[PDB]
Amino acid sequence: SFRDNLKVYIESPESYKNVIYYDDDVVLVRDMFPKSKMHLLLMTRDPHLTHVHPLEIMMKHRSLVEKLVSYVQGDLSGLIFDEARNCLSQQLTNEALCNYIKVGFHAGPSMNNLHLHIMTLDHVSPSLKNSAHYISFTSPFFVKIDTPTSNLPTRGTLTSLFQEDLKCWRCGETFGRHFTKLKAHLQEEYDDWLDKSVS
Amino acid sequence: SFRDNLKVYIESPESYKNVIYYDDDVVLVRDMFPKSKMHLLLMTRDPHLTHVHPLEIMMKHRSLVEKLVSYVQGDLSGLIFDEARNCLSQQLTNEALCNYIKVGFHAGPSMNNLHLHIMTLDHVSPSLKNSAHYISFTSPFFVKIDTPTSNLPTLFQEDLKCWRCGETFGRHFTKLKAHLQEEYDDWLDKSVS
Ligand SMILES: Nc1nc2c(ncn2[C@@H]2O[C@H](COP(=O)(O)O)[C@@H](O)[C@H]2O)c(=O)[nH]1
Ligand SMILES: Nc1nc2c(ncn2[C@@H]2O[C@H](CO)[C@@H](O)[C@H]2O)c(=O)[nH]1
Ligand SMILES: [Zn+2]
Ligand SMILES: [Zn+2]
């Protein structure tokens, strides 16, 4: 099934050119359908954890949460910032980018193998093709990795994401059901952020 | 009244040892009663903006909002990280600190001259002495500077909640205090180089 598509990256990371880091424990892979300018997935290779729902990981497997966060903040940090510079602009410092990257799980992932999203905020991407994808990263369905355990949402359903009034994550302007207009506005917001942020 | 006391920093910043930056437009000053390990205030010197309510600034003075943000992320960012290192640990990188600093206005300001808080998340401080102090920085009363304008208002009653893990302590302020210290030690241990 398509839900098992990510398994190949944790079975044979050495074989896939969009895997930009691996070791015995984790794989860092570029999303092939990126939903922001930079969109990476950090995957555990542990066969006993990969099929655990991310909300069960956040509640009951804090050892893994801490290990994943230690990779994002530690050994992989320079790699992630360099990928953002490649995806956005080389003139962005780590300091500019830190505030423009989010890290989290979906409350209802479409793929079966556990994957932590590491992505820029912009949501400017040709692969962002419908508003359910947008909502899945800009609502509580996106469970940030530092969410207090008391605050975790319910297990979700990607296909039930729907908003009658689509909303810009940065300024709050709304667009009804007109996703095309929202995308054009996200491009303007990105242009503005970039102008204000480059060195 | 004493509520006008921050005015001295924007009138005569050269005169006060807790001012760590000034220019014609802004002053960056240490909070005298810090509510986290690092707690700074960034103040406009503009006499026509200093007395404007912070929610009116957020709604109607986006020019000033963008200017404050540009100072905080731009020209003052190294001073801010250096201050954080002086207050927390010299072993902390800018990258570790950037996720541990919040920037915002109180929705109901306690002083009359406009002041943007720039502070670490810990709330470990001898000057944090009651529940109102804590809740005013960890609840929607603290209006982050990146809040969308669609989300702005025109509470302190509820149970104390750790901002980091969400554990609650009822109205037991002293238990919250000890817990914040444990949370800070834990963050620090994982964050130092
Ligand atoms: N540097 C300085 N800070 C002050 C003085 N008086 C009060 N403060 C700080 O000013 C802040 C005002 O925050 P507010 O609640 O008004 O948004 C408080 O955190 C308080 O500790 C003072 O004379 N000098
Ligand atoms: N790299 C990669 N990403 C995928 C594949 N199938 C789905 N995705 C992405 O994986 C994520 C799962 O939520 C989404 O962001 C998808 O765009 C695939 O075969 N390879
Ligand atoms: Zn917008
Ligand atoms: Zn806690």
Residue numbers in the entry:
A (entry chain A): 33 to 231
B (entry chain B): 33 to 186, 193 to 231
What does the paper say about this structure?
In order to gain insights to how aprataxin recognizes the DNA 3′ cap, we grew crystals of the catalytic domain of S. pombe aprataxin that had been preincubated with GMP, the product of the DNAppG de-capping reaction, and determined the structure at 1.5 Å resolution. The crystals contained two aprataxin protomers in the asymmetric unit. The refined model included guanosine in the active site of the A protomer and GMP in the active site of the B protomer, in identical positions and anti nucleoside conformations. The phosphate is flanked by the catalytic His138, His147, and His149 side chains. The planar purine ring of the guanine nucleobase is sandwiched by van der Waals contacts to Leu38 and Met64. The striking feature of the guanine-bound aprataxin is an extensive hydrogen bonding network to the O6, N1, N2 edge of the nucleobase. The Tyr41 hydroxyl engages in direct bifurcated hydrogen bonds to the guanine N1 and N2 atoms and in a water-bridged contact to the guanine O6. The guanine N2 atom is contacted by the Arg62 main-chain carbonyl and the Asn50 side chain (which in turn, makes bridging hydrogen bonds to Tyr41-OH and Arg62-O). Asp63 is a bidentate acceptor of hydrogen bonds from the 2′-OH and 3′-OH groups. Lys67 makes a direct hydrogen bond to the 2′-OH and a water-mediated contact to the 3′-OH.
